[model samples]
Target chain A: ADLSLEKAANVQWDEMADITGSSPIIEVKQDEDGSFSIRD
Target chain B: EGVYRIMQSGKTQVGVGIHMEGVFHTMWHVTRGSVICHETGRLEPSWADVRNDMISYGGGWRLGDKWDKEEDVQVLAIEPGKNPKHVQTKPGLFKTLTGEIGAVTLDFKPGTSGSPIINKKGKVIGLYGNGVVTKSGDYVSAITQAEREVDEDIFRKKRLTIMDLHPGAGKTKRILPSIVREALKRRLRTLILAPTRVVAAEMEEALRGLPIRYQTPAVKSEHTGREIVDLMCHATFTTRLLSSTRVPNYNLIVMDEAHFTDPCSVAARGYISTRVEMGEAAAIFMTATPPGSIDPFPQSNSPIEDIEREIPERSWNTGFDWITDYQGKTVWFVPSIKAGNDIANCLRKSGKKVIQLSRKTFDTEYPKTKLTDWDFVVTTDISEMGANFRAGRVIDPRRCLKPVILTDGPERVILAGPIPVTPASAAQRRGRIGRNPAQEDDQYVFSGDPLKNDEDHAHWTEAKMLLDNIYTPEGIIPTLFGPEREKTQAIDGEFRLRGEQRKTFVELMRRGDLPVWLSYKVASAGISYKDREWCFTGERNNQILEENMEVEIWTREGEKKKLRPKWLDARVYADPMALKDFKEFASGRK
Candidate 1:
């Protein structure tokens, strides 16, 4: 009966090179707000 | 462009006034175009043309004459001031009267005129009007005509008349005079909304002619803005009484163009709403067509039922006939670009005696240039308002042909007019054809463009805009119906359910606030009807508009959704399975 997107947040992450640096990036934050956010 | 801008800028001005309340006020002028301003450039402004009734015996041509050759006279656009610039050359003939012609000014554009005339010092001397046609070159300059026409044009342009304030203007007749008389006997404070000053005057005149005796404590001058709620306490005829809140005893509120009662219309949402406070007033809405909200009851097909069961017998005076009845009759539905032309062609080719009904304006009959010698007439104003034309079949087209029989209470009687029809005016126009019943077994041919199919039909939509001036956000949005299936992919994310949409029919029903009986009808009647066949019966009368077909509500997504086609049948409830399917469709899934 709980209508929330909480389950949608716990998913595997795919790593990618940062386009600005052309280098591999580290995953620092995961599922903090249960909503996706863009960060630098 | 620079000169025009300068002229516009010159016309702009500011005014200061000191009130008796010791408050000083200042107002600024904004540039507005004349009524015919929309048709500028294509046709000569009416200002340049002067109508001359007399012909000079020996003279030739004059100023303002159309370019003609019969009379040997030179017509000139004389710049009448110091350092005045001759603007442009005249159109058509410029001559004198020797059984010949010169320049004859004509109404070129629909709403053009009211252009300013300047003197030598660049001062606006006269406004444009009908010009005089004369044989002599020394014909008189119709300075008076120019001034008067321009004044009237400016008066119209400046939003000075009641017509300017209200969009849909027309009168209503009480076919069931007994019912209305009884209702009025209750002595209700009536709010009469008219789209024009002339119409408001006519309504006032009609009310005066009525045997009802009500003292007018104060009749608001046609042009006054002062609120007179106090006058209602005394009893009198008032114009623009929508804003007067002090008068709480308004027993019956009569909105002339009642179809304009949108939450956004000025006459309604803006003012009349204030007058018709719920629990305080009894409201009677009058219009050539009901507003889509009341008549159609929106996508639910309830309006059609309302029309058939309620409106025809109560509000309107005309008899109702489905198109199927025209099978063996001389019936035609001319859906075309030139409706009159198609009618004319059909008359010539088929040799069937045809009757045409065209709306007439105040000063002229049938605002359009086309003429049709109608044999039988079903006219709204000309027939009901006592126009003396006796021979043909005179059908009274009063919108009050029906009383809205709602589920809540006694049937509310309304004056049916164009407001409801305008939203789907095209449908009404189509209905106007194949209306004649006498020519049974006679071959009747309809001529016009093919009728609009289910997709992209805009006749009714365009009509709504005309009725309320509800052209923008405050008007009917076209996408109340879901996008065509082909275009469904473009449905905005807000309208789509992302994943695992498990909303049950019962749950949706509980939350949807749909009437319980109507819900039952939808469930029971859902699957039985074919997709092409109407699944749910909507309010069908000839006066259905989008306003009545859809209910505006916030969806689960917190966005506004127009709910359409609630399924129901006479005296039966919808079954659970059918209700579920209908809910799915209502939720924008399939």
Candidate 2:
């Protein structure tokens, strides 16, 4: 099956965040009311 | 970095101090702040009647009183990116009257003399100019030029400049050479910069064999004949590439197509300003963008085929069924350069003259003399940006039955295949031809569903978040450019450039190690334009997969290709994305 570039990269979470400004970590829950934590 | 709050009578928070010099000099927006009815008469406009309660005082036409005149208009300072400290500003004469602002600057000098901002109805609003202007064109008449032929005035008489214009506006061809000629005459060390290597080459080409030596990979370190002073051409971000590269103090730097919004370019540009402000080399930043004179949320000619025909993956041989015999001037956007070549070769078998324009062959292939000669001009997203073509119709070939990746239900990694063009990209290609005002029927025809869903707005939001958080840094930028480029954890989540990968633009150039993509292909870590790919609609069909929050699909080969957003109907396959950090969530050990 021919795929477009969306298999664009063998990107991980870190790479995804850099590419899309979104992370699986986005859906993650935050522990404290700080900027750091976002759990998935 | 500090976001300050404005207080009235030292008590109530009325407005915000957006800009400040050091911790003391702060400029604020006093919107709805407590104003003492200083002028008891109704001759002049009252604080409630005019200017959104934001008071302005000067030249005696309005309220003769200064900001915080009778009342205690104290400014409470907040630490940069932190909560308000309620720290009072160290009292100083930080007065900025909006209307006729810079009538006070030293005679024959400048601050940022660009075009004066006018209302949507063309009424002058505020002053000052350059890059992303705010409030309104404050006092452009004081220093700002109208972005016309002020090169001489700005370079000779004025200090710094910001000229924003469109692509076909002769910015590269005319204004740039004009500036360089004058700069050379004045013996100023001039440096012309661009966002990418292609654009830099375009600039060098635009120079028309001028003495400005090409500092790109093509002519690296080749010192034949007189290399014109500090006169050079290099990528915008790679200006300070090598520490040992005998950096000359370029008295003037011209940025071509400076997309100030892109995150990747800011680092180098920041160093431009950071280098020196105390009367260093003159920098004329010719911003190639129309300054937002109006803040409306925001064209020509070309009639495309009304109906579109679907084609199987990689087989664009549907020339008859796809575009039909009704061929005038047309431009087709193929999937890739290779694919475009194949289609062009096959299409030409019927004696239909066509050519594929891409990053590599763009120089030779792009029809030099007559654009109306070619039957079809096949291209990719590269030509979609600012490339001019007189063609009317556009053909976009999309994949029908192909692999679709997914991640729903039980961590199921399945098969993957093809996808379609995006709404934004589709619109960009459509803008290539369409309504030349000469003819129209909406400009583009697609193989599959053009707009399967309204994802452009969401994609725009990603960019909006990116721009809004530029000062914040860590958020959208890190989320989008990461592999986290520089220093990070010894573990996986934080990508620390270990061995050779650790070298940046500075170190990479300084040391003999040829820069990776940063040196070669392009170090485009610009997440500002990183839009999400609208994925296949497979999750909508599978109810089990629909239950998950996010679904990302991939191929069995685990190819590290660009990932698209998936939902709706299609085959749900393996989502190799989370596979990297798969055990992290389950293990709960972060």
Candidate 3:
């Protein structure tokens, strides 16, 4: 489903995570090849 | 602007640092053709076409990898230094060296076309264009021509929730139409709650042009009961209206300046939980800063920093000079009613158009003249929320601007003491300015010590600490609530909860049974049901002290006394039978 622009615009990052039941913390590291990898 | 021709043609280029919202560091390739904007204005230069090679195709950094797609990133303008007069004559003299090319792109990450480039000391040097890391780990890129345009687009699209929006950012104004449209589309019963009647009336005025039907019910009016639900208005409420009535069914609920809805208070918590319990309702909470209680959450136990910084004293002369120097309208935030009146009188005596407004005068005396007509409008706390009086400028040069805080000092009620300004309150006060971009965003905060002694400072510290402890995530929810338990188990700075725990937490919150510490705090803050009488029997000083509503007790050898509702509630909370006593006390039972 397309995210509600109104809701998306008004919701904070932490609040969005809370509402979507997503992990609030995400770790990202620079790879040896200069690429980045993210783990939630 | 004088044009200068280069003496030599080489692969040399000059590194130009452009600071927009963020910093961008990119080099302009110099061959034989290069012209500079000698004046202080935007520069548009076309350089070598190395687009495809500059973008990392094999391994591209996508959005959300570094920062959230909806995050509102800061935009820093380029800082000016010495003029490039020599660069025009000796163009090739400042050509890009091979080593410097690698240095320019060292911090360039993919997917960020205009991202900030910082130096070793974490100071933003410039903005970066699309760049790629070579096999040798060297960074190279072409200067993005549409950097400002792209950044503007990004800024416009940036999603900021209500809480994230800074005051005077036109947040509520921007989202009001969207809210109205959504309510209409979804056929939702909506309610927009404000903390004050003035705010509600202001909102109603703003919404009059919209298609949605809405009303700000009169406080304590007979029609303000459940009949409000039967009216089927698209939106209905302000603080008092909501507080005095039963919870109405709403498919969508928007709490404007939600920070004032202190979760520690029973009424606020009950109202909020009830709204949350309507599982399908789209709840939107808006506030420039988190509520006082919620602010210290998760970090509530952090030690208070010492208050030793001596603020520079500001005199009335400085305030007069500051106001007279600026041609635009001004809003000066005074500390107290007396101070506000004094400042207004002083300004008026100086032949400046000034008006002093407070809660009492705002309703009757405010509309007598247009706010814009006045040179200065001095107020205590009326402009904090809802009332939109945009002056060409707003400043608190006296440094008396602070959130309304009423507390007893070492001397007690005879001398109402100094209340320390919270960081959030300071921010809100600063936000009173810059409503119009045409006006200056500059707000000077003159500072001076308000406290009299160490005891006064300690009292402020203690009060802040108490508020901090009471506003945490755990403090807002019931001790037995699922989220509360999970929060207790998690270590500081780490918010972790099992899936089951989270599910239970959501369920409990949905059930609207989660109690908040705010009610107790509010009761302690001197908001009590006026007609009701309460009793307290508690142990103090190793002796059982029994007190009725009429009785007053002296503590600290009669140096301090308590007879107020807040003090009564305090004694009740201290009692061993606190819960039982509170239940009986609240219900007005004998």
Candidate 4:
């Protein structure tokens, strides 16, 4: 599969890293298939 | 080989010196003294240098700065499986020779240059370059030119030189004056295939300052179809559009660097999409090194006779000969103090002339000797490149022997490190010997242990305890290709691709389809008078979406997103992004 990384406009890892700060937190949700939407 | 810290804190270890080769995780164990022990008693073909670790794993599995830079493999293309020589691909891609098979150790000595690297099936894949013994004592390989990248440059250069283009013509020099003249005569039509934008610029400079009239369909003036009357004026020059578009009917087509013959490359696609049979039109491929022994154009037999047909001039040709069998002798100058001195002493006692070369003391000794009359030259990694020596024999004690090593992100000229020379580099060393076509040479290699000192052998005893229970591929099929090649016939119209050819091509094409935006617009944006929309999609799939995406119309006034014209709206097609969005939004509504 071709993984296309949109340079500037996409959701980047750096932005996510900054939002979490030094300590880590977690987010959880449910998928349409009733599977856990949040995963590490 | 030294202390390599793993990301997991509990693990600490010691490894082969900076230059050895081995599967690190399985071979090393941590000791109570904070030192490391070898779990597998097996030694590498050479000692590793002290400057770095064997492999470094970094951020998110990214290979770290100090990984084994060289890859070594046997050359199977030349003489098939008869003479397996080693050489470097360019600097460190691969090495020539040094490995143990059963009880016998095989060292890629001199005169083994140009030998073909074959697979387990005996399929010729690459040429041997250089050889090295890893810090763990395993042999490594280097490659010179893989068939794909090699043939492309050779063909391109040959075509340019054959055209006898004047040197001052710049980009015009890339194409021959004869070709331009032939275009004028209507006898030979031209197709310029460039893989990259920068190279296209080079090709442009080569074709510039010439009187031939050309048109880039993707480029235009405000006026509609103001077709130039001159036949030269009617020619087409697009970055790679010639692949998908209707190229003008031409008699002869030359592909530059055709070894990178990707189906997506302009020339490859053009050849595939063309309704006109290439059979009627004479096709010439120019590349520096042809991939392996497989002929890309077997139908055009003018260039290929054999892998080494013209490589070694007829005057100085030599058949294969092992170093142990040669009457003449060569010497190895190792860099390590204890290791180098000890090895030299042993060989000297055996009636062999051995020399010790060290960076600190060499300056004073080199000038004093009448060594100019000596049979062999002695130097370290600094003397690797551009140094051509043709002797009857060559001896190397260490395997990290290249002056330059190519890395993933950038290229570096290496020194003062434990650099692992790949098989390709070792093969290049063989090229140094028996340079003339008439004479052959031999190479001798002495592999060293990976441990820092003899006391380290005690740590190895613990390694035997860990490895005694494990089983691995010991014998069975030793060579690259065991017996598969005998049953496989050469496919019609297909040439065999060597390992180097395959490896380089994969790296070149990994990025996928070339965008018309990068090739046509960004490359030729300011040069043209017309603002023609460069709309292009692959023949088989919509691979090039950047061309289809609404780009910003750049001008002196300002910039804004471009919308497709009503007349050109029919040309629009769905892209991956549109498809993904459609699926996401439509799922709920449906």
**Which candidate number has the best DockQ?**
3
lDDT of 2 by residue, B15-110 (tens): 332221211111113332122222321211111211211222111112112322122122122322233222111111211222221111111112
TM-score of B chain for each model? 0.25, 0.40, 0.44, 0.23
Query: Please, what is the TM-score per model?
Result: 0.24, 0.38, 0.42, 0.22
Candidate structures ordered by lDDT, highest first: 2, 3, 4, 1
Off by over 4 Å in 3: A1-40, B1-162, B167-170, B209-246, B261-270, B277-280, B292-320, B365-372, B397-416, B439-441, B448-590
On lDDT, the stronger of 1 and 3 is 3
Indicate the worst ten consecutive residues by lDDT in candidate 2 chain B: B139-148
**DockQ of predictions, in order shown:** 0.00, 0.01, 0.01, 0.01
lDDT measured at residue B420 in model 1 versus the true structure, 0 to 100: 23
**What C-alpha lDDT, on a 0 to 100 scale, does residue B107 get in candidate 2?**
14
Model 3 DockQ, alpha carbons vs. true complex: 0.01
TM-score of chain B of 4: 0.23
Q: Higher lDDT: candidate 2 or 3?
A: 2
Candidate 1 per-residue lDDT, tens place, B1-590, comes to 11111111223211111111111111111111111121122111111111222111111111221212222121112111222123322233322222222222322221122222333332233323223333433222222211120122211111211211111111232222332344444443334444333444444445543443322324333222332211121012221222122433444444444333221122232223333332344444443344232221122100111121222212122353432223222222222113334444434443334443332232254221125443332233222111223121212112211112133432222222122222233233222222111111112221222221222222122122212221222222223211122212222222222112212212222333333233323333333211212222333331212323433433434555443343332111122333444444444444
Name the runs in model 4 displaced over 4 angstroms.
Answer: A1-40, B1-175, B211-246, B266-280, B292-590
Q: What is the interface RMSD of candidate 1, in Å?
A: 38.3
